Design a protein around this motif. Sequence first.
Motif, PDB file in Angstrom:
ATOM      1  N   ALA A   1      16.155 -14.357   3.071  1.00  0.00           N
ATOM      2  CA  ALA A   1      17.459 -14.824   2.496  1.00  0.00           C
ATOM      3  C   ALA A   1      18.536 -15.793   3.874  1.00  0.00           C
ATOM      4  CB  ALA A   1      18.009 -13.522   2.109  1.00  0.00           C
TER       5      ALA A   1
ATOM      6  N   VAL B   1      12.934  -3.099   6.889  1.00  0.00           N
ATOM      7  CA  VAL B   1      12.105  -3.739   5.892  1.00  0.00           C
ATOM      8  C   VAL B   1      12.918  -4.319   5.128  1.00  0.00           C
ATOM      9  CG1 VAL B   1      11.654  -2.194   4.064  1.00  0.00           C
ATOM     10  CG2 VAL B   1      10.082  -4.001   4.970  1.00  0.00           C
ATOM     11  N   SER B   2      13.499  -5.835   4.928  1.00  0.00           N
ATOM     12  CA  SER B   2      14.652  -6.600   4.333  1.00  0.00           C
ATOM     13  C   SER B   2      14.605  -8.026   4.305  1.00  0.00           C
ATOM     14  CB  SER B   2      16.136  -6.060   4.651  1.00  0.00           C
ATOM     15  OG  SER B   2      16.914  -6.928   4.029  1.00  0.00           O
ATOM     16  N   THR B   3      14.775  -8.483   3.622  1.00  0.00           N
ATOM     17  CA  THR B   3      14.681 -10.429   3.842  1.00  0.00           C
ATOM     18  C   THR B   3      15.787 -10.959   4.548  1.00  0.00           C
ATOM     19  OG1 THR B   3      16.453 -10.116   2.057  1.00  0.00           O
ATOM     20  CG2 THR B   3      13.939 -10.348   1.312  1.00  0.00           C
ATOM     21  N   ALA B   4      17.007 -10.132   5.112  1.00  0.00           N
ATOM     22  CA  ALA B   4      17.700 -10.692   6.131  1.00  0.00           C
ATOM     23  C   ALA B   4      17.585 -10.735   7.816  1.00  0.00           C
ATOM     24  CB  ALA B   4      19.326  -9.525   5.536  1.00  0.00           C
TER      25      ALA B   4
ATOM     26  N   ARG C   1       9.446  -0.545  -4.184  1.00  0.00           N
ATOM     27  CA  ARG C   1       9.320  -0.788  -3.251  1.00  0.00           C
ATOM     28  C   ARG C   1       8.224  -1.590  -2.431  1.00  0.00           C
ATOM     29  NH1 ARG C   1       9.588   5.537  -0.783  1.00  0.00           N
ATOM     30  NH2 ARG C   1       8.984   5.144   1.593  1.00  0.00           N
ATOM     31  N   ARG C   2       7.570  -1.691  -3.264  1.00  0.00           N
ATOM     32  CA  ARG C   2       6.440  -2.104  -2.969  1.00  0.00           C
ATOM     33  C   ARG C   2       6.044  -3.620  -3.343  1.00  0.00           C
ATOM     34  NH1 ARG C   2       2.037  -4.911  -6.864  1.00  0.00           N
ATOM     35  NH2 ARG C   2       0.045  -4.139  -5.663  1.00  0.00           N
TER      36      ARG C   2
ATOM     37  N   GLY D   1      11.433 -10.185  11.114  1.00  0.00           N
ATOM     38  CA  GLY D   1      11.895  -9.844   9.069  1.00  0.00           C
ATOM     39  C   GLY D   1      11.923  -8.293   9.086  1.00  0.00           C
ATOM     40  N   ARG D   2      10.654  -7.871   9.460  1.00  0.00           N
ATOM     41  CA  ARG D   2      10.556  -6.166   9.006  1.00  0.00           C
ATOM     42  C   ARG D   2      10.198  -5.373  10.462  1.00  0.00           C
ATOM     43  NH1 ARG D   2       4.598  -3.765   6.599  1.00  0.00           N
ATOM     44  NH2 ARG D   2       4.589  -4.459   8.552  1.00  0.00           N
TER      45      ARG D   2
ATOM     46  N   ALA E   1       3.720   0.200  -1.821  1.00  0.00           N
ATOM     47  CA  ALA E   1       4.941   0.558  -1.048  1.00  0.00           C
ATOM     48  C   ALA E   1       5.096   1.835  -0.365  1.00  0.00           C
ATOM     49  CB  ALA E   1       5.727   1.829  -2.489  1.00  0.00           C
TER      50      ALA E   1
ATOM     51  N   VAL F   1       8.548  -9.302   1.928  1.00  0.00           N
ATOM     52  CA  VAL F   1       9.505  -9.039   2.964  1.00  0.00           C
ATOM     53  C   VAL F   1       8.418  -9.473   3.529  1.00  0.00           C
ATOM     54  CG1 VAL F   1       8.898  -7.244   4.113  1.00  0.00           C
ATOM     55  CG2 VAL F   1      11.547  -8.150   4.463  1.00  0.00           C
TER      56      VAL F   1
ATOM     57  N   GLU G   1      17.742 -11.375  14.023  1.00  0.00           N
ATOM     58  CA  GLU G   1      17.518 -11.778  15.830  1.00  0.00           C
ATOM     59  C   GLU G   1      17.899 -11.700  16.539  1.00  0.00           C
ATOM     60  OE1 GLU G   1      17.502 -15.432  12.380  1.00  0.00           O
ATOM     61  OE2 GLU G   1      16.029 -15.175  14.457  1.00  0.00           O
TER      62      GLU G   1
ATOM     63  N   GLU H   1       9.345 -13.655   2.584  1.00  0.00           N
ATOM     64  CA  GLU H   1      10.556 -13.965   1.905  1.00  0.00           C
ATOM     65  C   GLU H   1      12.228 -13.660   2.543  1.00  0.00           C
ATOM     66  OE1 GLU H   1      10.887 -12.421  -2.116  1.00  0.00           O
ATOM     67  OE2 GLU H   1      12.317 -12.376  -1.965  1.00  0.00           O
TER      68      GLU H   1
ATOM     69  N   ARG I   1       3.009  -9.604  14.042  1.00  0.00           N
ATOM     70  CA  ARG I   1       3.773 -11.052  13.302  1.00  0.00           C
ATOM     71  C   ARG I   1       4.449 -12.774  13.772  1.00  0.00           C
ATOM     72  NH1 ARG I   1       3.037  -5.775  11.230  1.00  0.00           N
ATOM     73  NH2 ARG I   1       5.840  -5.367  11.373  1.00  0.00           N
TER      74      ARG I   1
ATOM     75  N   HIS J   1      13.263 -14.377  15.446  1.00  0.00           N
ATOM     76  CA  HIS J   1      13.479 -13.817  13.777  1.00  0.00           C
ATOM     77  C   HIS J   1      13.029 -12.982  13.690  1.00  0.00           C
ATOM     78  CE1 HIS J   1      14.026 -13.266   9.585  1.00  0.00           C
ATOM     79  NE2 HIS J   1      15.162 -13.098   9.523  1.00  0.00           N
TER      80      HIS J   1
END
Lengths: 322, 321, 322, 332
Positions: B111, C185-188, B98-99, C179-180, C17, B105, C191, B109, C160, C177
Amino acid sequence: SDEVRKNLMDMFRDRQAFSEHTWKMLLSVCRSWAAWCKLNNRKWFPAEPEDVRDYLLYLQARGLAVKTIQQHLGQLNMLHRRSGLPRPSDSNAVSLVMRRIRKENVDAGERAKQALAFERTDFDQVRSLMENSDRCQDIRNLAFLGIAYNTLLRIAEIARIRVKDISRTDGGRMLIHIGRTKTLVSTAGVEKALSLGVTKLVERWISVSGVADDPNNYLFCRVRKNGVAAPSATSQLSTRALEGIFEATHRLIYGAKDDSGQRYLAWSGHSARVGAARDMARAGVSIPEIMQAGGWTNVNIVMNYIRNLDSETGAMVRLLED
Amino acid sequence: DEVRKNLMDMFRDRQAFSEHTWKMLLSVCRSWAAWCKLNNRKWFPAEPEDVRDYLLYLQARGLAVKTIQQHLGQLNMLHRRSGLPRPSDSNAVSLVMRRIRKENVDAGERAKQALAFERTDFDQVRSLMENSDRCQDIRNLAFLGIAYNTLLRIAEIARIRVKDISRTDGGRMLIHIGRTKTLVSTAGVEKALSLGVTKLVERWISVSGVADDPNNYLFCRVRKNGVAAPSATSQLSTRALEGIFEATHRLIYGAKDDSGQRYLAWSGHSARVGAARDMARAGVSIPEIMQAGGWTNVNIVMNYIRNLDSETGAMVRLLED
Amino acid sequence: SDEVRKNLMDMFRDRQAFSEHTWKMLLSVCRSWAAWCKLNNRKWFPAEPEDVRDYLLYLQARGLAVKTIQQHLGQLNMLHRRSGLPRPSDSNAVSLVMRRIRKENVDAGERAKQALAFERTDFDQVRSLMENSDRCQDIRNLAFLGIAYNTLLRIAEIARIRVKDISRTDGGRMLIHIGRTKTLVSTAGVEKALSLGVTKLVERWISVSGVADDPNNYLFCRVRKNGVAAPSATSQLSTRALEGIFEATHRLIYGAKDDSGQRYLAWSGHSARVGAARDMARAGVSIPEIMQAGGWTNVNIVMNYIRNLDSETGAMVRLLED
Amino acid sequence: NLPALPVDATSDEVRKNLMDMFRDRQAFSEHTWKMLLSVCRSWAAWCKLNNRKWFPAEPEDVRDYLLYLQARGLAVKTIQQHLGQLNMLHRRSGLPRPSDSNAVSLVMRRIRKENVDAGERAKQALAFERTDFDQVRSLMENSDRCQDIRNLAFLGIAYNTLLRIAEIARIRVKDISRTDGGRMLIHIGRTKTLVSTAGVEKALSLGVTKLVERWISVSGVADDPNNYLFCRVRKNGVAAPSATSQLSTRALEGIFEATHRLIYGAKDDSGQRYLAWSGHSARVGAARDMARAGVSIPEIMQAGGWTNVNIVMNYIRNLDSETGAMVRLLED
DNA sequence: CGATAACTCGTATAATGTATGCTATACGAAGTTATC
DNA sequence: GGATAACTTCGTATAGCATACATTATACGAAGTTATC
DNA sequence: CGATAACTCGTATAATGTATGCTATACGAAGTTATC
DNA sequence: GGATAACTTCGTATAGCATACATTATACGAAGTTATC
Ligand SMILES: [Mg+2]
Ligand SMILES: [Mg+2]
Ligand SMILES: [Mg+2]
Ligand SMILES: [Mg+2]
Ligand SMILES: [Mg+2]
Ligand SMILES: [Mg+2]
Ligand SMILES: [Mg+2]
Ligand SMILES: [Mg+2]
Ligand SMILES: [Mg+2]
Ligand SMILES: [Mg+2]
């Protein structure tokens, strides 16, 4: 253990909390597992993992379908969980062999079949052909197929419709109220609307059979050789007779079926669901609306029901042929 | 003690997994084993404390979050399938991921996905090979055809065979497809080539002469001279089909940058994407577009077109009237 | 205990975290708690039911907001649960008092406040007011607003935004774009595209500001007293500064803020979202589309953000008056 | 209050919790308390008649009781209410709840099924749509009666604002104001929810404004800005303002009932629920009119202060506006 | 040089999703009270 | 004293709405902090 | 009295969501092997 | 002979698809049942 025999008695007592179709298969799988275990010197309960794995392999050998095996293992797991004991599928042994049996049989060429479509075109054909008949049977079977394709309701659900479940929209379009479906059993239920023409098809059947006499009469019933409907309110038309109406209507336009001994050589119960499923997809209906239509929530089965165009085809073809 | 027995039952049925799965399983165990015996830690069964550390390292190396999840996830399959408590189950580990994820992110990073081998690109590449006679040239173009006209996966093409292509009343080639690694296929089973594409395929069938035998795999090898060497025991590797794409892009825009970025030139899914996107520009219903390519996860399809003008949102509309 | 001290430590160890704001609070709360605990002769950990109840009751007396009190009781909970101990909310005494304090307060009037709408009407004004000015900051700001209304993005998120996050539609609009966010909270990421008019405003600030010389630069930077941007890649414009942009553009049009102490007395961080929702609501946009518009997944809150047209109002009035 | 936690049966910390619960009774709506006490009373009485310890409830006993509420012909939603209160009373006092046990969980399931098949279905308010307001208003707009003027005003406000009845009985004079357009504007303060998704202010049409206004002129409720908008009107036709006692929601439901009897006559004979307008008809109705008028769901939902579309969807389900894709194809 | 424009802290408070536990309404009947 | 219109209270049967949960964000007056003026 | 139309029963197998645990692609680079 | 063209085999880094879970329902050929002809 005391707790186990009590947990079991609790279940068998309130067995009616389950589908009558679940008990039928529970007993079925059990009596089959009962055999093998006696004809192989095994304790059938509680099931010992190594034996369940052996029993699963035996089934594969018998040539049974992937899904048929998944169920035998399926009920065994239930009987156990519902007991209080751990499931056979909780042991690596049983767990894996199942996946294995699955992986193997797929490559071997085994795939999951599916009902043959009864699309708009078919309904359009069977109407102009029986549309004029005055036979009760003919009048009925048309309204049945009418509702089947127009609502995507499962045969089980159609067979349960009562005349008192029917009302009409401000516009003159019938509305069948469905209570318990396969994946929903509540007091709210949903309202399924018929097209302006199908409602005619049904009306003509309602009258020609006098089922509107008692509002507790089931919409569909029997018609004996004399051509007389036997409206009832305690006896609904069996889902077998409804699966009948399809096989017949199919023969009526294609005569005796293959000798193969395969399923879905002729229209069966699920034929209108997958059919309309396709027809919609093909007419560009949105995801959420194709959903509402079938009472679905995900998008899988829908996608499973597609393979649309073959000859000229469309999608890419139509696109490339700019 | 009893994990010995479990691993037995585990290996006793290894087909319960795809070769590709088994590979990564091993591949990761190796990385684990190494790092472990260099920082001096018992590798199996792994204490949640060490894994916590290990993962923290994959991060330092710069591995993508998706990759780290693959590693941790792989450790688990090993423990669960050995009768042990998977590390993902402990507070320590699940608190690190989670950290890391958040940590990564924020760093940016992001995808990525395949490069869009769209329509305008099947043309350009086409005309520039439409008038050539190199058998190998013919093939490649006759693959960059199928692929775009079927949204078929590469491994799926490698396994097609001349016991399949059938004709149409109107003159179109249908391509039956069996032995699909999917029980409940929410995808196709019979895709049809267009005129143009059928054309180009026919041409390859003769010049490569694979017809001779049925069990013959359609697409095959071609040595440095120009002689199609059909077979029916080995297929034109996916690595190879990948290249057919790779090369074709080079031949038009040149070579790749030295910056080791991924997806800098058409790959296997490069057809899928463009395929999807084009239909989307045409007005094809999302469900139609999904059965064209055999999808089910509509968010995926919604990713390959995320940036078209047709799917820009409702606030744009309001701002323009 | 001992096991507690550990868990407590593993929780602080990977404290990264959890969001920063989560921590700033856990502390702000334990402070206020322990404070009250020390002076009132009560322990502080584990927290005792009656102690926590008299405490929550104290925070109510001080006159704090219901949502505020739920935060203390909340953080206080996270502490214990996270450290393997039972939650003070798991005891009847606490959970019942918290419920009470809500009703008692809701009945006395106290209701939640909400961002003051910054709707489309306001945007058109702010623009036809600064639209011209060749001033650096005046440029930046009318840009930020354009993005704020157009994308409904929260502010912390607009902060950000890096230059390497902007792209374009083959049609001309920008594709920022993200991101979070707060929910995800992801890499995908997702948009958010801007209109042609806003894509334009953004362009103008990109050139005139110089943030473009480096891609890893944060789209919005500061502007010193002279009139020159301060492009970075390790320093975001503070969110506080962004709330400010709002605070002033309001002062610019409606002057000084009536000193009354009350909140949401003039536009702020959310002014744009509630606004955007409201404007969409009025235009008839569907639920699923208003959702995507703000990365929401429940019609709630959007509903809350609505209490539409004042005075003449409509909908049910437009209907009655025909 | 509660039936009789036993000197013996009741014991230790459940007397502690049970004590801690009445301490913060304000933690529950007065209505909840009425239902908690009603179920207990009802279970306690079934227990004495069949000789069972009423608390803590043994599962086999809760099960006999659930099957008993079924045979009495009670509705599934009611049976679950009973199960729910028994469950509160327990958990909210430290003991294991029934339904937290295997037996009670299966009967509840079996009962819900068996029942859905007897063809039991949820009912819903009889709609009071625009055409009914038009008909009702064209008959009562000619009366100088003080009661007739009050009612025509209540209906108008109920149909136009979609406010629940409880809310209408709370509107006090000082809440009405005048909009530039020459029409009113009612403000609804003090809800119950921390977040009121309906709307602080509701505006009336000009027509409805003339209706409310004429009631104010004849009732003399303005004599004090703290008087409630609606009040009694005795045998003799005299309004009776007050700022301490509002009308009962029971009477507002009595206005809808009567107004429906004036037009369609005496009710029916079956024990059928919903054979005449009730305090929820103007909402169901107004929702449908709105749908038929091409209003978007969010705009509808806001109009009535709804937050779970599943409901307004349930109210506009039989419209042609909502018939579906399969019909559209068959009809092109 | 010092005065300014323009930008880190701490406490208070909103936001984010939804099964279901709580909270309304329904309505016959009993009880009240000012008027015929 | 009666009878009665028009409520109010009650109690039990059901429909319908909004909250606990675990965080994650914003709101905003104050201090503190730099480059310009 | 049959003959016949029109309708329980047991084993086998499909249908219902979907989060995340498999599965498959990416790609540099090191082995292959019949040609140049 | 030595140098490739065009592929394979590999191992690790990332993307993307489909299944386990717990029931619930349909398929369909055979045998049994009932008014009608
Ligand atoms: Mg299973
Ligand atoms: Mg009540
Ligand atoms: Mg009407
Ligand atoms: Mg009354
Ligand atoms: Mg009245
Ligand atoms: Mg009526
Ligand atoms: Mg949540
Ligand atoms: Mg009376
Ligand atoms: Mg079987
Ligand atoms: Mg499921």
